[PDB]
């Protein structure tokens, strides 16, 4: 449900995700690096599936962050794909792909894979 | 066909893979890297499914290579997961995970993922 996803979330590395889910399935917000002052904020955009199932199933969603802002440019982009599971302890469980811009020759090792779980802290 | 997995395969990067498939599911062989070289060879071990389904499906398999031999140690290991499709143009289509030994702090970016298609040409 949009409300449930909207709010502030943190993951186990200490990064901050602030998102607003709109009624049309859109996701917009900011992502912040683990601790590290104010200019560690990047724009994110994503989509969620606004009519999940009844049942105790999660809501699929995904978003992207290109790591460039006015202070830094890490020439890479990450996409998180996962499910939102609500309750008193709502969580967003994801698997992510971080791709860096490489030359032809290093393309083979351009992508990293991992997983993060986000805990909601504020609405 | 079944032990059609046995032989020498090449991928798009130039790496060569030489494997023997046992009748009970084992996969054993050598993986050699760049240039051909001499000791660019590493041992590989895996398993395949020796009784695949009878709908034209491919044969599921996978194998691992630890990047250490008596000349080099890259403190990493790669696992390829995929399926074998035989025929006139046999291929092994895979996705792989390369994990490096890191310290806690670098654990979040310890794994790369990619895909390779191997053929006998």
């Amino acid at each position: 449900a949009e409300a449930g996803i909207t709010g502030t979330w943190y993951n186990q590395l200490g990064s901050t995700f602030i998102v607003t889910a709109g009624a049309d399935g859109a996701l917009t917000g900011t992502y912040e690096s683990a601790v590290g002052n104010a200019e560690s904020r990047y724009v994110l955009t994503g989509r969620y599936d606004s009519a999940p199932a009844t049942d105790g199933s999660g809501t699929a969603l995904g978003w992207t962050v290109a790591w460039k802002n006015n202070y830094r440019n890490a020439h890479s982009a990450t996409t998180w794909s996962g499910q939102y599971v609500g309750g008193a302890e709502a969580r967003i469980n994801t698997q992510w792909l971080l791709t860096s811009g490489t030359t032809e020759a290093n393309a083979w090792k351009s992508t990293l894979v991992g997983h993060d779980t986000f805990t909601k802290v504020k609405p | 066909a079944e032990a059609g997995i046995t032989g020498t395969w090449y991928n798009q990067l130039g790496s060569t893979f030489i494997v023997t498939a046992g009748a009970d599911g084992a996969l054993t062989g050598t993986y050699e890297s760049a240039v051909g070289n001499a000791e660019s060879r590493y041992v590989l071990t895996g398993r395949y499914d020796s009784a695949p389904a009878t709908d034209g499906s491919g044969t599921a398999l996978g194998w691992t290579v630890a990047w250490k031999n008596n000349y080099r140690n890259a403190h990493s290991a790669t696992t390829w997961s995929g399926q074998y499709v035989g025929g006139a143009e046999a291929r092994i289509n895979t996705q792989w995970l390369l994990t490096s030994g890191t310290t806690e702090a670098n654990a979040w970016k310890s794994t790369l993922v990619g895909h390779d298609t191997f053929t006998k040409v």
């Binding site: 020759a105 083979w108 | 990067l13 130039g14 760049a34 990047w67 080099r72 890259a74 790669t78």
Partner: peptide, 8 residues
């Protein structure tokens, strides 16, 4: 890395 292409 031994998994990649030649360094040539």
């Amino acid at each position: 890395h031994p998994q990649g292409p030649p360094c040539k």
